[PDB]
Amino acid sequence: NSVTVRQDLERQLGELREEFNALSQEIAMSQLIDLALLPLDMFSMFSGI
Amino acid sequence: MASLIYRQLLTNSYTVDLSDEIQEIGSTKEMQYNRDITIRFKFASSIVKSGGLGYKWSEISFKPANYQYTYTRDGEEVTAHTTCSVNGMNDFNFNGGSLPTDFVISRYEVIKENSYVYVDYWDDSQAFRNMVYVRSLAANLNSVICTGGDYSFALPVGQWPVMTGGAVSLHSAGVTLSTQFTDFVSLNSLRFRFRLTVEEPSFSITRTRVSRLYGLPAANPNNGKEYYEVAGRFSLISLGELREEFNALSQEIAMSQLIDLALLPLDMFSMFSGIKSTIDAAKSMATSVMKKFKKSGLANSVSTLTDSLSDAASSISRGASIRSVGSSASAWTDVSTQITDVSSSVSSISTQTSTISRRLRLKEMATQTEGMNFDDISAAVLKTKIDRSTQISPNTLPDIVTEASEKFIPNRAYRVINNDEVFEAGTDGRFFAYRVETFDEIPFDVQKFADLVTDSPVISAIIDFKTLKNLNDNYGISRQQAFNLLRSDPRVLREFINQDNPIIRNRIEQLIMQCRL
Amino acid sequence: MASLIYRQLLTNSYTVDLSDEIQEIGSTKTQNVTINLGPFAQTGYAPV
Amino acid sequence: PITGSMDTAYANSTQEETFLTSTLCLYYPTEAATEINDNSWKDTLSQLFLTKGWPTGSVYFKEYTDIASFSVDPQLYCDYNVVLMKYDATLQLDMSELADLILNEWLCNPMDITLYYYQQTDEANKWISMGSSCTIKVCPLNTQTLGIGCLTTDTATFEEVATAEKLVITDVVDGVNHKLDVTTATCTIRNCKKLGPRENVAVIQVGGSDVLDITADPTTAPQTERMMRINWKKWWQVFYTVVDYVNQIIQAMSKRSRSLNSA
Amino acid sequence: NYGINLPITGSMDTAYANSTQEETFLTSTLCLYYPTEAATEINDNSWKDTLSQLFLTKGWPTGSVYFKEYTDIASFSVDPQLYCDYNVVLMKYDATLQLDMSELADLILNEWLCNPMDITLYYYQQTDEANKWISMGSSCTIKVCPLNTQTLGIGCLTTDTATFEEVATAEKLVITDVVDGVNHKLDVTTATCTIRNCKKLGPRENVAVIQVGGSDVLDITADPTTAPQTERMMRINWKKWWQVFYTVVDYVNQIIQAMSKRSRSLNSAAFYY
Amino acid sequence: NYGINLPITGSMDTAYANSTQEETFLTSTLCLYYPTEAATEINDNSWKDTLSQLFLTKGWPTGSVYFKEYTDIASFSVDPQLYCDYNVVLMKYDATLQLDMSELADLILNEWLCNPMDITLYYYQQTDEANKWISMGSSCTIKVCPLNTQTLGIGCLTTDTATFEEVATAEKLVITDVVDGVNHKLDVTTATCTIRNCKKLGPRENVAVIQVGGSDVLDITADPTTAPQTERMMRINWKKWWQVFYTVVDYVNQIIQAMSKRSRSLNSAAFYYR
Structure with missing residues (x-):
C-alpha cells in the first residue's frame, strides 16, 4: 500500500567512464591474456554483477 | 557461411515454440504524415446492488466508455472518437457484516500500478486513413491525473457511507496497432496504453473501515469532469508466381562477386537486415521462417540420420540386419547400402552410391566439412535475390527460404581424398577413381569407399572430374594449385574464375542456373 | 558434438527467462496475501 | 594547418586595413545621450572619429534604453561592436546574462x-x-x-x-x-x-568596483580583453575616451570567423 | 603518521592512478551550509530530498549528503562545528556585514x-x-x-x-x-x-566558501600588503536560490576537487590546549 | 614530507634514552575528573590547593594540574570536552548505573x-x-x-x-x-x-578510568566474544575520598605512564587526523 513507485536516478554516461579508465590502470598482464582464450560467451558475462 | 545461416536456424527452432505460445495467450479467446494530437476520453462504471433490504452492493466496475469531440489542428477542424477501457483492475471488497442491515460491497474495482488504461482513437483527417502499412510510430504526450469523485451509498436507514478520493496519473506506454468493428465498418488505430502511477489523494469509505488506500476506484472515476485530456505530438515513419521471377533474376548474378559472399558467415542477423517491414514480421518471421524449416525436407531428413545412428548404436544387441558395403554397420554407409527403398533401370554401384550419396551429400553439410560448401553457394543465391526484390510482407519470407534448401542444386557430388586418391560419389549417376596427380581413372570401389566416407572429412567438390580433366589438359594446373582445387579452396578457385575465365566459368555458373527452384 | 549440445544449452539459457515470464502473465492470477496483520493487548467490560 | 616556418616579415600596421574596411557600432543607454543634451553629439563625435582614422560613413550610434531590452535585441549591426554599460547594482546579473550573450559565440x-x-x-x-x-x-x-x-x-x-x-x-x-x-x-x-567567444564586443563598464562573475560554475572566473572598464565622471568624458582610444579598444576584439548559418 | 622523517622517493615512475573522484564518492560526506533566507525562498518540504536524488547523478550515495541551516553569518560564525568531510558554505554578501563575513571566512578557510x-x-x-x-x-x-x-x-x-x-x-x-x-x-x-x-597556519582543504552576490572580494590578510586568493574561495552569480543549488549540484565534483579530503579529524577546529 | 606515507628502519642502536617522565612534567597538563560526592566528602575550601602543592612532589609545576567536577555519570558522559593533555577520570561504583558507566568508558577510553x-x-x-x-x-x-x-x-x-x-x-x-x-x-x-x-578507530592514549568500588567490571565490547582489558582501565579500593586522591597523587606518574601522549592529537600528524 504504497501510493507511488520509488524513483532512483542513475549514473550519467559521461560519469561512469572516468572510473572505468582509472580501474583499468591496474589490470595484470598475463592473467588478462589468458582470459581471452576462454569463450566468455553469453551465460558467462551476465553471471556476476 | 551458408553453413551457419542454414544450420544456425534449425539450431534456433526451439524458440519457435515459446514465441508461438505467446500470440495465443495474447491471441483471441515512402510517405510520412504528422499531427499534434488531442486525446479526450472518459471512463464509465457499472454499479449493481444486491437484492434484499437494500444495504448491499454486489458490483462496482469499470465499463468501456465512448467520447466524441472536435478540435483544431493546422487550421482544420478534426472530428475524433475515443473509447476508454481498462485492464488489470484489482478486486476489493467491503464486508460490514452478514446481517441484512450491514453495509457490504461484494466487489469493487480499483486501477493501480499493475493496471492499464487503453484509449482507442480515430479521427476524420486523410493521413490517418492512409495508414495501412506502418513501418514505425512514437508518441510524446503529457500525463494526466484522473481523480475519483464522491459516491454515496444510500442505505434504507440512516447515515450514508461515502466512497471518496483516489487518484492515478497516466503515462504513455508502448505504441501498437488496433481496430474497432461496429455494426458494419472498421476504424483503424494504434491505440496507446497508459501505465499508471498512484497519486494523492488516497481513497476511503466514510463510516467504515476503508481508508488510506491508493488507486482509482470505479465508483466515480470521472469526478464530474466531462472528459480527461492527454495532448502532445506523435511522429510516424512510413513506407507459385514468385518463383518464375527468382529464376530470371538469377540469370544476372555475377560470378566472382558471388563466390566471395560465401566466405562471409552470413548468419541470422545478416539475412533479415535488408528486409524492410511494417512490424514484427522479419522478427517472428525469422521465427516463422523457422516454424517452416522444422517441417520440411532438410528438417526430418537430418532428424533421421541422427536417429539411424542412435538406434543402430543403441540396438546392436538387436542391430538391424541391414547390410553394409564396407568394414561394418554405420548409418551413413550401410543404412543407405541396404534401405534401397526405391527401384529399377541401370547398374548396381550407382544405386548404392546414389542412396549413399543422399545421406552423405546434402545431409553431411549441416555438420562438418571444408572449402565452399554447396549451400554456401546457395545462401549466396538467396541473400542475393531476396534483396533484389525489395518486398516486405510476412507470408513470403518463410517457406520460400525453406523451399530453397530442399530444391537447390538438385544433384551434386562429393569426394574423399586419401593417399592421393580422389574418390568421387557422383550422386544420381557416375563415380570415378583418381591418382590425384596425373588425373587418371582406376577401378572405383564400393569398399575402399565405404569407410573413408563414413568417418573422415568430405569435400563438396565444387568442380568435379568432367570439368577438371578438361581443365587440366587445356591449361597446366600446377601441382600446387591442383592440390587446392580439390579441397575446394576459396582462393585458388576465386583466382581462375576471376583471372583466367575459361571453363571454370561454366562449372560455376551452371550451378547458379541450377539453384533455380 | 556433445561439446555443442552441452555448451549450446548454457549458451541459450538467457531465454529461460523470457519464456518463463510468459506463462505468468498467462497463468492464473496472483494475489497479495500480506495484509500486514497486528498483534494483541487485552482490554474489557467494566460496569456493575 | 599552417606551415610553421619562422622568418620574421612583420605586416606592418593592421589598423590601416580596419580603418578602411570595417564598421564601428557604439551601444549606449538612453540616460547616456540624455545627459549629453545636444542635437549634434553623434555628429561631433563622428568628426572626432576621423582623427582616430574612421571615414565619415563608418561609425554608427545605437541607443538601447535598458539593459533588459538591449539584452533581448542584440542584433549587433556592425563589424565591431563596443557596448557601454551602466553600473546599476540591482540589475548586475541581468547585466551578467547580457554580457554572457554578447561576449560569447552561441x-x-x-x-x-x-x-x-x-x-x-x-x-x-x-x-x-x-x-x-x-x-x-x-x-x-x-x-x-x-x-x-x-x-x-x-x-x-x-x-x-x-x-x-x-x-x-x-x-x-x-x-x-x-x-x-x-x-x-x-x-x-x-x-x-556555447563555445567560441566574440572577437567583437567590448563591453566597457561604467562604474562601481565592477568585478562580476560571468561563469555558471563556482570554480572558474574568466577575465577577457573584450571586457573593459572606465571610471565615470560625465558621459561626454566617457565618449571622448572611447574615441581617443578606439583603436586600442578595437585591437582588443577583431573580425570573426564563425560560419554561422543564421546570417 | 609517526612518519615524516626520511624522505620519499622523487622518481618519476610517471604513473598516475587514474580518477580520484571514485574514492571520494564512495568514502566521503558532503555538508552544505546555507542561510535561512535561502531555504525560505525555495518553499518546498522536499527540497533537501529532491536535491539528494539529484546528487546521486553527480555520484554521491543517498546517505552521503546533508544540509545544515545557519540563519545568520554571525551565528554561523561562532558555533561552527563543521560536521562533514567536505564543507561547502553558501554566503550571499550582505554589504553591511562584510567584515563579519571576512572574519568568518578567515576562520573556516584556514587552519587554527x-x-x-x-x-x-x-x-x-x-x-x-x-x-x-x-x-x-x-x-x-x-x-x-x-x-x-x-x-x-x-x-x-x-x-x-x-x-x-x-x-x-x-x-x-x-x-x-x-x-x-x-x-x-x-x-x-x-x-x-x-x-x-x-x-594561524594551515589552510583548509575543505570549505569552499561560495559567494552569492555583489562584486565580491575578501581580504584574509590583516595586513595591507598581501591579498590571497585561494581555490577554496569561489563565487556564483545570483538569480534565484533554486538555481544556486542546481549549480552547486551540477558542479559538486569541481567544487570538491578544489578542496580535498583527508584534513578533518576534529568536530570543531578551534583546536584546544 | 608530511603526507602520511610511512617507513622507518629499526637498527638496534640500543640507545636506551633516559627518563621520559621529565618531559611530561615540564610540558604536559593533568586533568582530574571526579563526581560531586567525592568533593563534598572532603569538605575543605582548599582541597584542590593542598593537593596541588602535593603534586609538586610528584613533579608537576603549580599551574599544571586542573580539577573538573562532573556531578553524575550521565552528565559527564555528555559533551566529553576533555580539557587537558592527560585525563584521569574517577568513577564511583553505582551498581544501577553500570551500563551508563560502560557507555561512558567506551567513549573516553577510545578514539571515535x-x-x-x-x-x-x-x-x-x-x-x-x-x-x-x-x-x-x-x-x-x-x-x-x-x-x-x-x-x-x-x-x-x-x-x-x-x-x-x-x-x-x-x-x-x-x-x-x-x-x-x-x-x-x-x-x-x-x-x-x-x-x-x-x-571506532584508535584507542585513547590519555584517560585512565580509575574505578572506585565493587569488584569490578565495565566491558566495552558490544559483542560476547571478546573482553578487552587495557592499561588505561585501573581500579582502586575505596576507603575514604581523601585516601583516593592521596593515592592518585602518590602514583601520578605510574598512572600517566599507563597513558602518555594522546597520539591522535600529536602535532606530527596529517592524513591520520587530529
Whole structure:
C-alpha cells in the first residue's frame, strides 16, 4: 500500500567512464591474456554483477 | 557461411515454440504524415446492488466508455472518437457484516500500478486513413491525473457511507496497432496504453473501515469532469508466381562477386537486415521462417540420420540386419547400402552410391566439412535475390527460404581424398577413381569407399572430374594449385574464375542456373 | 558434438527467462496475501 | 594547418586595413545621450572619429534604453561592436546574462516546452530564454518520466528558477530530464550550446568596483580583453575616451570567423 | 603518521592512478551550509530530498549528503562545528556585514590553533603575523590597553577601563590584531564573550566558501600588503536560490576537487590546549 | 614530507634514552575528573590547593594540574570536552548505573570518528563491528524499525512508530548496535537527543578510568566474544575520598605512564587526523 513507485536516478554516461579508465590502470598482464582464450560467451558475462 | 545461416536456424527452432505460445495467450479467446494530437476520453462504471433490504452492493466496475469531440489542428477542424477501457483492475471488497442491515460491497474495482488504461482513437483527417502499412510510430504526450469523485451509498436507514478520493496519473506506454468493428465498418488505430502511477489523494469509505488506500476506484472515476485530456505530438515513419521471377533474376548474378559472399558467415542477423517491414514480421518471421524449416525436407531428413545412428548404436544387441558395403554397420554407409527403398533401370554401384550419396551429400553439410560448401553457394543465391526484390510482407519470407534448401542444386557430388586418391560419389549417376596427380581413372570401389566416407572429412567438390580433366589438359594446373582445387579452396578457385575465365566459368555458373527452384 | 549440445544449452539459457515470464502473465492470477496483520493487548467490560 | 616556418616579415600596421574596411557600432543607454543634451553629439563625435582614422560613413550610434531590452535585441549591426554599460547594482546579473550573450559565440535550436521534456548535456549546454516577461518553472524527472519533488501534472509543484526576466540563461543539473513550464506567451526559450567567444564586443563598464562573475560554475572566473572598464565622471568624458582610444579598444576584439548559418 | 622523517622517493615512475573522484564518492560526506533566507525562498518540504536524488547523478550515495541551516553569518560564525568531510558554505554578501563575513571566512578557510586566555589575571603579548586573538559569542565587546615595559598604560590607566581603547563593539565573531610584541591589559565582556589566543597556519582543504552576490572580494590578510586568493574561495552569480543549488549540484565534483579530503579529524577546529 | 606515507628502519642502536617522565612534567597538563560526592566528602575550601602543592612532589609545576567536577555519570558522559593533555577520570561504583558507566568508558577510553545523521529524511545501516550509533543528550529515547530490501518494515510499519522496537528509554549516553548490513528507519526524540553515526578507530592514549568500588567490571565490547582489558582501565579500593586522591597523587606518574601522549592529537600528524 504504497501510493507511488520509488524513483532512483542513475549514473550519467559521461560519469561512469572516468572510473572505468582509472580501474583499468591496474589490470595484470598475463592473467588478462589468458582470459581471452576462454569463450566468455553469453551465460558467462551476465553471471556476476 | 551458408553453413551457419542454414544450420544456425534449425539450431534456433526451439524458440519457435515459446514465441508461438505467446500470440495465443495474447491471441483471441515512402510517405510520412504528422499531427499534434488531442486525446479526450472518459471512463464509465457499472454499479449493481444486491437484492434484499437494500444495504448491499454486489458490483462496482469499470465499463468501456465512448467520447466524441472536435478540435483544431493546422487550421482544420478534426472530428475524433475515443473509447476508454481498462485492464488489470484489482478486486476489493467491503464486508460490514452478514446481517441484512450491514453495509457490504461484494466487489469493487480499483486501477493501480499493475493496471492499464487503453484509449482507442480515430479521427476524420486523410493521413490517418492512409495508414495501412506502418513501418514505425512514437508518441510524446503529457500525463494526466484522473481523480475519483464522491459516491454515496444510500442505505434504507440512516447515515450514508461515502466512497471518496483516489487518484492515478497516466503515462504513455508502448505504441501498437488496433481496430474497432461496429455494426458494419472498421476504424483503424494504434491505440496507446497508459501505465499508471498512484497519486494523492488516497481513497476511503466514510463510516467504515476503508481508508488510506491508493488507486482509482470505479465508483466515480470521472469526478464530474466531462472528459480527461492527454495532448502532445506523435511522429510516424512510413513506407507459385514468385518463383518464375527468382529464376530470371538469377540469370544476372555475377560470378566472382558471388563466390566471395560465401566466405562471409552470413548468419541470422545478416539475412533479415535488408528486409524492410511494417512490424514484427522479419522478427517472428525469422521465427516463422523457422516454424517452416522444422517441417520440411532438410528438417526430418537430418532428424533421421541422427536417429539411424542412435538406434543402430543403441540396438546392436538387436542391430538391424541391414547390410553394409564396407568394414561394418554405420548409418551413413550401410543404412543407405541396404534401405534401397526405391527401384529399377541401370547398374548396381550407382544405386548404392546414389542412396549413399543422399545421406552423405546434402545431409553431411549441416555438420562438418571444408572449402565452399554447396549451400554456401546457395545462401549466396538467396541473400542475393531476396534483396533484389525489395518486398516486405510476412507470408513470403518463410517457406520460400525453406523451399530453397530442399530444391537447390538438385544433384551434386562429393569426394574423399586419401593417399592421393580422389574418390568421387557422383550422386544420381557416375563415380570415378583418381591418382590425384596425373588425373587418371582406376577401378572405383564400393569398399575402399565405404569407410573413408563414413568417418573422415568430405569435400563438396565444387568442380568435379568432367570439368577438371578438361581443365587440366587445356591449361597446366600446377601441382600446387591442383592440390587446392580439390579441397575446394576459396582462393585458388576465386583466382581462375576471376583471372583466367575459361571453363571454370561454366562449372560455376551452371550451378547458379541450377539453384533455380 | 556433445561439446555443442552441452555448451549450446548454457549458451541459450538467457531465454529461460523470457519464456518463463510468459506463462505468468498467462497463468492464473496472483494475489497479495500480506495484509500486514497486528498483534494483541487485552482490554474489557467494566460496569456493575 | 599552417606551415610553421619562422622568418620574421612583420605586416606592418593592421589598423590601416580596419580603418578602411570595417564598421564601428557604439551601444549606449538612453540616460547616456540624455545627459549629453545636444542635437549634434553623434555628429561631433563622428568628426572626432576621423582623427582616430574612421571615414565619415563608418561609425554608427545605437541607443538601447535598458539593459533588459538591449539584452533581448542584440542584433549587433556592425563589424565591431563596443557596448557601454551602466553600473546599476540591482540589475548586475541581468547585466551578467547580457554580457554572457554578447561576449560569447552561441549556437541555439528551438525547444517545444509543450510536447518534450528536456536535459542539458555538458558545461556548455544552457537554456537561453528571453522576451517581454520570462517566467520559468522546472520539474526534474527520474528515469521513469516521473517528478522528483513534483507532479508532472500540476505546475504548482514545479520549482521556479526565473520570475519575469527579460534575458535568462538557465542552468540545471546536467544529465537529467526536466518538464519545463515557461510562459511562452511573453517568452521564448531556446536550447543553446556555447563555445567560441566574440572577437567583437567590448563591453566597457561604467562604474562601481565592477568585478562580476560571468561563469555558471563556482570554480572558474574568466577575465577577457573584450571586457573593459572606465571610471565615470560625465558621459561626454566617457565618449571622448572611447574615441581617443578606439583603436586600442578595437585591437582588443577583431573580425570573426564563425560560419554561422543564421546570417 | 609517526612518519615524516626520511624522505620519499622523487622518481618519476610517471604513473598516475587514474580518477580520484571514485574514492571520494564512495568514502566521503558532503555538508552544505546555507542561510535561512535561502531555504525560505525555495518553499518546498522536499527540497533537501529532491536535491539528494539529484546528487546521486553527480555520484554521491543517498546517505552521503546533508544540509545544515545557519540563519545568520554571525551565528554561523561562532558555533561552527563543521560536521562533514567536505564543507561547502553558501554566503550571499550582505554589504553591511562584510567584515563579519571576512572574519568568518578567515576562520573556516584556514587552519587554527588556539589556547584559552584569562583576561582577569594576566597581562600578555601577540608574537608574529600569525598570532591573533579570536573571540566569539553573544555580544563581543573588546577594549584594550597597551603596556610599556613597566606594566604601565600608554594612553591609558590600567586601573580605569574608561581610558581603554575600544576595538570591537558587540560582534558575534572577532579576530583582533594588535601591534606585535607589546603587552596589553584586556577588557572583554566575558559574560557574553569568549576570547582565545590563536596561532594561524594551515589552510583548509575543505570549505569552499561560495559567494552569492555583489562584486565580491575578501581580504584574509590583516595586513595591507598581501591579498590571497585561494581555490577554496569561489563565487556564483545570483538569480534565484533554486538555481544556486542546481549549480552547486551540477558542479559538486569541481567544487570538491578544489578542496580535498583527508584534513578533518576534529568536530570543531578551534583546536584546544 | 608530511603526507602520511610511512617507513622507518629499526637498527638496534640500543640507545636506551633516559627518563621520559621529565618531559611530561615540564610540558604536559593533568586533568582530574571526579563526581560531586567525592568533593563534598572532603569538605575543605582548599582541597584542590593542598593537593596541588602535593603534586609538586610528584613533579608537576603549580599551574599544571586542573580539577573538573562532573556531578553524575550521565552528565559527564555528555559533551566529553576533555580539557587537558592527560585525563584521569574517577568513577564511583553505582551498581544501577553500570551500563551508563560502560557507555561512558567506551567513549573516553577510545578514539571515535562521527558524522551527523538525519533521522527525518534517510534510514540508515551500520557496516562493520566498528560502526556504532552514539547518541547523547537530555533524554535519549531511540526506537528502531529494520527494513527489508524494499524499504518495508520487518515486524513494523515504517508509518506508525507504535510498531517500532524500543532500544533505549531516556538515557544520557547511548551506544546503539543493530544487526550489521540492514537498513533501519530510526525514531529518536531529537528534541532532547542528538544521534550521530560513529566509526571506532584508535584507542585513547590519555584517560585512565580509575574505578572506585565493587569488584569490578565495565566491558566495552558490544559483542560476547571478546573482553578487552587495557592499561588505561585501573581500579582502586575505596576507603575514604581523601585516601583516593592521596593515592592518585602518590602514583601520578605510574598512572600517566599507563597513558602518555594522546597520539591522535600529536602535532606530527596529517592524513591520520587530529
